[PDB]
Amino acid sequence: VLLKVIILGDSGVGKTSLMNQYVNKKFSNQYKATIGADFLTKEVMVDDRLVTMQIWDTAGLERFQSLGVAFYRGADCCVLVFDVTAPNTFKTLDSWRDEFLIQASPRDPENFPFVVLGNKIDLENRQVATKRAQAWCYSKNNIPYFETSAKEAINVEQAFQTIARNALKQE
Amino acid sequence: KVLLKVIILGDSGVGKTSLMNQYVNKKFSNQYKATIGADFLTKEVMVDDRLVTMQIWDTAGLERFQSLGVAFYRGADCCVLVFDVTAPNTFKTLDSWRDEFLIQASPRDPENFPFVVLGNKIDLENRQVATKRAQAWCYSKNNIPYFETSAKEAINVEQAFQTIARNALKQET
Amino acid sequence: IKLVRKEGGLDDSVFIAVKEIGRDLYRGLPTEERIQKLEFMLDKLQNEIDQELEHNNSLVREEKETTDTRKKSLLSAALAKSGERLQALTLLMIHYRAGIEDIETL
Ligand SMILES: Nc1nc2c(ncn2[C@@H]2O[C@H](COP(=O)(O)OP(=O)(O)OP(=O)(O)O)[C@@H](O)[C@H]2O)c(=O)[nH]1
Ligand SMILES: Nc1nc2c(ncn2[C@@H]2O[C@H](COP(=O)(O)OP(=O)(O)OP(=O)(O)O)[C@@H](O)[C@H]2O)c(=O)[nH]1
Ligand SMILES: [Mg+2]
Ligand SMILES: [Mg+2]
């Protein structure tokens, strides 16, 4: 029983930092752009059983994307990340979610498992408010919403525990 | 400063690693050090007046099981096909190496993509693949150049890679 | 930004394969020398990625600022080829990373 989770969202929002904080318990300040994709593996406990979670990090920058359509068809759960200090990254969430649904073409697209992370809450002068993001998540079939900091490991463990539960729904 | 990416292909043991090391490092190992580990070396070369950077990729290892050409061949400007003139079976597989590259790299104009064929180990003074034979195969493959080489004695090594550089440069923007 | 659709893009199997093979990279060498050679390769690969990524960014800046359609079309093809080289280099780095991860699971 293997769970395939993919992380999507604009470049710079913290997709790689969130994956590395959850699996490796480490965080780095310096930016290394993700080219193409990579995955890490983690055993996670759901209910009292170990399932293997395969967490796919992907390129936010369009010119560095290389994954084919067949790849997205096997995703069990899709994580949407934005930056609470960068409202354009919240604005584009619709196009990430919709384009993924077109390529994944799940059998019941409107109940596909998404989880949304609002990252970098450790920064001052956040420009997207919690209720505003919550309103959006509610409107999209009430998908779970976590506010996270990869830099300070706020809600990282809690978010991925929900991601794993949602991925099992599909599987 | 133009960068030229060169893939070297061919059966285990023909001298791929040794041809790269002899061109780039001017060193040869008599010892058989089989390629564990894809790697590339870099060398500045002058092509008629232009100074260009050549990256020479040595991706193949013990057995072909690796689909790793899908990962590593992309972006190449030239592909070097190497066989051992003392082992006719290494010449027999050239078609499959050339086709492998064309399928897994998907170059923009497959029929004009620069290939170069090196028949290696002429110093072993045992020639089981005749010079005319390799040239006939090469001619039929859209007229690609053929060089007989020795990585051990540095025979034709500098000459082969100068032509590799030129032909890699020729098909670009 | 958006999710590019690429009909023959990469599949699971390529990443799984580079990791499976990479796990045994330089197996045979002493546990001392093995981790030496792997660190050397990851450092060399990062420097090469950095270099290429700086050339890539320079091509991006210049394509944004060009009005001449001919020179834009040439910049786009160079940027595409830079992108392909970066994909290969990144998959090579992932290959050697699996060697490191093999040492530290042991
Ligand atoms: N302050 C703060 N910085 C973060 C946080 N998460 C990531 N960063 C930093 O933000 C920058 C971008 O982070 P990445 O994880 O590389 O972003 P990415 O989403 O993977 O970007 P791409 O690979 O281009 O798609 C890096 O410099 C990180 O150090 C966070 O929660 N708080
Ligand atoms: N006599 C002679 N021996 C050579 C020559 N070139 C390579 N060799 C020897 O042939 C053997 C194979 O050399 P490699 O360079 O590792 O061959 P390779 O094509 O990279 O293939 P793998 O070893 O399987 O990775 C080694 O013992 C070399 O010393 C040559 O030009 N003349
Ligand atoms: Mg990233
Ligand atoms: Mg070799």
Numbering used by the authors:
A (entry chain A): 7 to 177
B (entry chain B): 6 to 178
C (entry chain C): 999 to 1104
What does the published report state?
PDZD8 is an ER anchored lipid transfer protein containing a lipid-binding module of the synaptotagmin-like mitochondrial-lipid-binding (SMP) domain family. PDZD8 consists of an N-terminal transmembrane helix, a SMP domain, a PDZ domain, a C1 domain, and the C-terminal coiled-coil domain.
In the asymmetric unit of the crystal, there were two molecules of Rab7 bound to a single molecule of the PDZD8 CC. The direct recognition of the PDZD8 CC on the closed conformation of switch loops explains the GTP-dependent interaction of PDZD8 and Rab7. The MBP-PDZD8 CC bound two GTP-loaded Rab7 molecules with Kd values of 0.67 and 11.1 μM, respectively. The asymmetric bivalent binding of Rab7 and the membrane anchoring by Rab7 impose a constraint in the orientation of the PDZD8 CC–Rab7 complex, positioning the coiled-coil domain parallel to the membrane surface.
